[PDB]
Design a protein around this ligand. Structure first.
Ligand SMILES: *[C@@H]1O[C@H](CO)[C@@H](O)[C@H](O)[C@H]1NC(C)=O
Lengths: 51, 51
């Protein structure tokens, strides 16, 4: 039950990704498991976001 | 979208070419600064009257 979900963290966002992993650990379940792919980028950059 | 994006060299030259232009046109004197905004223009101030 692998669920692929993309994610976007602005470079310099740390505590957000931390709380993100903590959320992943606490809300993890035997039924299904979320499989995030993280890519850090410039959030203000439209090109980077599109890519 | 191919990552990492690679720009062509010629582009910078074409940009400079476009920005360095000074011509006469329907908008009056046409010239640009480094950022590409209009410089040395004339905006006619008009009033609607009876005639
Ligand atoms: C042309 O535009 C530039 C930018 O605003 C200004 O510095 C300069 O004085 C202008 N030249 C004339 C002759 O109006």
């Amino acid at each position: 039950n692998s669920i692929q979900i993309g994610g976007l963290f602005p470079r310099g966002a740390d505590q957000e990704y931390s709380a993100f992993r903590v959320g992943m650990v606490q809300f993890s379940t035997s039924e299904f498991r979320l499989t995030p792919h993280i890519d850090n980028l410039e959030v203000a950059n439209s090109f980077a976001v599109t890519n | 979208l191919a990552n990492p994006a690679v720009p062509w060299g010629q582009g910078v030259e074409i940009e400079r070419a476009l920005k360095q232009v000074q011509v006469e046109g329907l908008s009056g004197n046409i010239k640009f600064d480094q950022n590409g905004k209009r410089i040395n223009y004339t905006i006619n101030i008009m009033e609607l009257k009876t005639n």
